């Protein structure tokens, strides 16, 4: 009501909120009215025009779901057992060599398996009793409803992580994979041969660059945060011939950096999906061993993520 009456009915260009937006409006009006303009320099005064559009935003607002490296844990065995090997378990005896995974405790053995599942390793345990072994259900300890002075729930979760990691390490031994010992984790990668010299549902898993061969590798680790999952990390390893590795950290690091120079999101995602689909035991999952009749089944599809704001090319 204070603008002079001689310009109220004229359209006005907004500059209060921004001057770049107002400048874009001015440019649009000038272009639509064909105002003369010249002197296009070799230094590309069109770049300044490009930059004075303020710039765009994420107004597209697609869905564009995303995948992950997380495998959701499903169908957990109902309980885990502590076997009171008071004097039955010999001292100075490690637990790794057990074909069937377990963790040593104060005097017991912590495992998902039944008592006589280690008959070959400890034949003396033939006369072991049932009242000794104590069983803790799994579906309620995860929710945090369990609390005892004999054991702490967090320690039980850590023990479950240890069991899951032991099972994951064991399951690659017979799966025809090659293991490499990194700083603190073991990476499992497929070799030459079994594919059509490279493929899995049309994904080059092992390739060759200028001089030697590069191999895609997966490392895994079980967790319960935010929810029981298996996390996967990707790696690129290098072999001179294909059957022999290079025992040098600097050369491997340089080759890995050079190879990842050209890979993009689609390459990483497809290679991860192909490698993880390779380890499938059935059509839509793969199982890990914790009991003679109790299995831990793991989904073979990553936990997908959904958004509502995205972009385009």
């Amino acid at each position: 009501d204070d603008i002079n009456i001689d310009i109220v009915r004229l359209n006005a260009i907004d500059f209060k909120m921004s001057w770049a937006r107002g400048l874009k409006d001015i440019l649009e009006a000038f272009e639509k009215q064909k105002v003369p303009k010249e002197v296009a320099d070799a230094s590309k005064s069109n770049l300044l025009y490009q930059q004075i559009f303020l710039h765009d935003k994420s107004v597209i607002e697609k869905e564009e779901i995303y995948d992950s490296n997380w495998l959701s844990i499903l169908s957990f065995p109902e309980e885990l057992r502590f076997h009171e090997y008071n004097w039955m378990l010999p001292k100075r005896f490690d637990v790794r060599e057990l074909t069937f995974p377990a963790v040593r405790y104060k005097n017991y053995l912590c495992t998902f398996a039944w008592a006589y599942d280690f008959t070959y390793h400890l034949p003396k345990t033939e006369t072991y009793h049932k009242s000794k072994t104590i069983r803790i259900p799994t579906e309620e300890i995860l929710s945090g409803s369990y609390d005892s002075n004999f054991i702490r729930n967090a320690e039980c979760k850590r023990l479950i992580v240890q069991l899951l990691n032991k099972a994951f390490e064991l399951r690659m031994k017979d799966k025809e994979v090659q293991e490499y010992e990194m700083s603190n984790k073991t990476a499992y990668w497929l070799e030459k041969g079994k594919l059509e010299k490279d493929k899995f549902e049309k994904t080059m898993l092992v390739g060759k660059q200028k001089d030697k061969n590069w191999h895609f590798a997966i490392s895994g680790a079980s967790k319960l945060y935010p929810f029981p999952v298996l996390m996967i990390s990707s790696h690129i390893f290098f072999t001179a011939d294909g059957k022999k590795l290079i025992d040098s950290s600097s050369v491997q690091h340089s080759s890995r950096r050079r190879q990842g120079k050209n890979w993009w999101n689609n390459t990483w995602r497809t290679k991860l999906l192909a490698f993880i689909k390779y380890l499938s035991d059935d059509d839509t999952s793969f199982y890990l061993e914790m009991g003679s009749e109790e299995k831990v089944f793991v989904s073979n599809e990553p936990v997908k993520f959904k958004g509502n704001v995205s972009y385009n090319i």
Binding site: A20, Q51, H55, D67, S68, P226, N266, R269, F305, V309
Partner: protein, 454 residues
């Protein structure tokens, strides 16, 4: 099937009330917040170093263009952007003979040669600052490619020994400004900047303008009455033990008017190895120092304090914090991590997940994508798939959405560089740099406590 929430990109405030999102675009469109008149360059080093500095300075007078100006905006020129005269006519040159570097380089020990080189350089700078009448705003130390290579500690000790004189210093390498000439034995530039020359000019000009007393930009959207902190723990190696925890902090209120960002500094020490935690008395001292710094500047204690860290707090230091914290001041201890290996892949192909996606796990934990695809520059800030930051409210009560918004706001104040955004809140980064400088020489009483001196 999990869901991702989105948080709006914060805006930084440029000259005459103009906001934007990119620092380079905002500077090239509106210019710095403050107005200097010129930069008086002091140069210390060899004659060829002076020639390289002179020719680079005359090189960045004229506009520089990138291979793709959309990803890397062009540099219009120093007087075009910063409206300050940073010209070669203001150079005050102190000559360091190549022979002196010859004596101080070709010895056998490493600590002694580093100490000798630092002694030479800071001694010339100290004499020129003390007993000369010419004024120098920023001292540029152009070192050859035989000190930063054969004596790399030199930079940290050099910056630590100048703290008693408050000398803003910018170290440069001869290959940095003479990348065209500094080829290898093959005849190829090891530091090819042909397509990103404008980026280097942007970075150097912004750093020099900031060290010369200028404020280039500031964030616009941050509430008042809240003071942010960042604590970082460093290992000291020159002591008797292999390592003793040394905590150094950076501090950031909003202002009375705009962007107070100094750094609550003065290192605190825990002798126990590996215990990246504060004893109750040291936590009391640090919290009292920060609170008094706020009180003297605004007059009332802040109502919210958002302490950040890369480590988890224990209960002892937290209860000490509450003991020294007033009843009217909220206290929220946040923890920021990177080691969690979460990765979101784009199902549609080439480009990666957009930057700003948040996976709010629960009330007290979320994932944030501070690095990713930015629609304005149309490029992803990483090469491989970016890894998010796992932000979890370790202690106290505060909205997770607000925490994520503040963490994305505090990733734009990287005056050391001219990029779109950082991948970690800049408070922690600057606390890290301050601690790294301070734990290089163990004699500094009441450190200067301003970022231009580090």
């Amino acid at each position: 099937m999990k869901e991702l929430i989105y948080i709006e990109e914060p805006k930084i405030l440029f000259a005459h009330g103009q906001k934007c999102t990119d620092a380079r675009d905002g500077l090239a469109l509106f210019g710095p917040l403050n107005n200097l008149y010129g930069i008086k360059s002091g140069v210390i080093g060899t004659k060829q170093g002076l020639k390289i500095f002179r020719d680079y300075l005359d090189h960045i007078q004229k506009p520089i263009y990138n291979s793709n100006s959309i990803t890397r905006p062009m540099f219009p020129g120093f007087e075009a952007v910063f409206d300050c005269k940073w010209e070669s006519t203001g150079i005050t040159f102190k000559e360091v003979t190549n022979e002196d570097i010859g004596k101080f380089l070709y010895n056998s020990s490493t600590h002694k040669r580093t100490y000798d080189l630092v002694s030479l350089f800071i001694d010339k700078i100290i004499s020129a600052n003390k007993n000369e009448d010419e004024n120098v705003d920023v001292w540029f130390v152009i070192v050859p490619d035989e000190i930063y290579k054969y004596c790399r500690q030199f930079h940290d000790q050099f910056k630590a020994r100048l703290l008693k004189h408050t000398i803003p210093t910018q170290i440069f390498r001869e290959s940095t400004l003479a990348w065209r000439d500094f080829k290898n034995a093959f005849g190829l530039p090891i530091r090819d900047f042909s397509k990103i020359e404008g980026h280097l000019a942007w970075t150097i000009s912004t750093a020099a303008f900031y060290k010369a007393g200028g404020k280039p930009w500031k964030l616009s959207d941050v509430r008042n009455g809240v003071c942010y902190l960042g604590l970082v723990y460093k290992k000291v190696e020159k002591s008797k033990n292999p390592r003793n925890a040394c905590c150094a902090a950076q501090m950031f209120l909003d202002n009375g008017d705009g962007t107070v960002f100094k750094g609550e500094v003065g290192p605190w020490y825990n002798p126990k190895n590996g215990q990246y935690h504060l004893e109750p008395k040291e936590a009391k001292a640090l919290l009292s120092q920060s609170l008094q710094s706020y009180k003297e500047q605004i007059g009332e204690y802040p109502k919210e304090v958002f302490i950040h860290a890369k480590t988890r707090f224990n209960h002892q230091e937290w209860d000490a914090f509450l003991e020294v914290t007033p009843k009217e001041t909220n206290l929220v201890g946040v923890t920021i991590s990177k080691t969690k290996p979460l990765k979101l892949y784009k199902t549609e192909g080439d480009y990666t997940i957009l930057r700003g996606n948040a996976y709010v796990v629960n009330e007290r934990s979320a994932f944030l994508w501070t690095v990713g695809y930015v629609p304005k520059i149309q490029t992803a800030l990483s090469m491989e798939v970016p890894n998010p930051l796992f932000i979890e409210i370790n202690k106290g009560e505060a909205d997770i959405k607000q925490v994520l918004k503040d963490i994305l706001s505090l990733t734009k104040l990287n005056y050391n560089a001219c990029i779109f955004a950082d991948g970690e809140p800049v408070t922690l980064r600057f606390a890290d740099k301050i601690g790294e400088i301070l734990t290089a020489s163990t004699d500094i009483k009441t450190p200067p406590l301003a970022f231009k001196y580090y």
